[PDB]
Design an enzyme around this catalytic site. Sequence first.
Site: not given
Length: 345
Positions: A145, A244, A291
Amino acid sequence: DLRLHLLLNTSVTCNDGSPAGYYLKESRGSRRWLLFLEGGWYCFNRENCDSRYDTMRRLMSSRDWPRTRTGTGILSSQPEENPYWWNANMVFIPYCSSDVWSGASSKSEKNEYAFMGALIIQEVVRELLGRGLSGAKVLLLAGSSAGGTGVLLNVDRVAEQLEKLGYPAIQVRGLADSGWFLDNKQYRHAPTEAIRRGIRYWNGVVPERCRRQFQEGEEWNCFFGYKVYPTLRSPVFVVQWLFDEAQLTVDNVHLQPVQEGLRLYIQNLGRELRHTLKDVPASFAPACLSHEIIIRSHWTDVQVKGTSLPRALHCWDRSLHPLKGCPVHLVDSCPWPHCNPSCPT
Ligand SMILES: N#Cc1ccc(Cn2cnc3ccccc32)cc1
Ligand SMILES: *[C@@H]1O[C@H](CO)[C@@H](O)[C@H](O)[C@H]1NC(C)=O
């Protein structure tokens, strides 16, 4: 378990001035080192950072951190959980700077918070050299991330740091997971503005070649993978879900009866992401809504064209010594979330 060490240089701090640090588990029969950058969005002004300090304080302070942490996924030491690098030296660097790992600003009479992400990484590397990193053959800088974007922003600076310290034999490489975003038009009506403001608030730093391309006032461009990746010299493997969840959140898409306008939007998002990866030789991009992946315990389950992510990373290692039956570029072509059967449920 990886064991916490707070930084000996106490001028390198989390947002609130407490010391930054790292969690370490050594493997003294290995010359591979994995340094993983945690993610968790960011904050870009006083009011927004004050809110984060109330209810996300572990991402802003070390005062409540545990003394140990369990290694999972690519940080696991068990071959069953981690077919790729189970015998490596393992490092988890907590994200307590709220700056996508870009900042170089101390707390002072003019700054309520310190934003030292870029300096935290350099100080971790410096102190690890005394604990065995000086003997390494490969340093893989990984992250998920905001930590995945952090890899893209910092991998070449780590490479330069070790060169200038006198370690030209350590091969520095990057692994960016779920950090490859598009500055696209939203589905309903701007996140580039928050990044542009953040960089000023943080005194943020971007890689030099990218900075020289976009020049003053436009450094925000280098936070976007498809723009900064062509400027990097270190080898970088890119993991990115085609749909995503954080990309869709900023695009104001919330998924069960999808009409034509949203169908076209979602299909065009996957096509555009697929296009930006077409000239990235080491990549893994499944057609799933999800994610992060690389520190999840079941990261071994997903496959593209029959090849798992741990296998793809092993093939990348071999390529850095094309390979028969050992592919390194794996991008789904089917155009809708979960058209790949191995997607996480
Ligand atoms: N336009 C736009 C846009 C803005 C934010 C995000 C998601 N996101 C989450 N953390 C991030 C760190 C650095 C960069 C992006 C990040 C995606 C797209
Ligand atoms: C501690 O870190 C700061 C910030 O990078 C640096 O200016 C200082 O020289 C460091 N101290 C030592 C002893 O290396």
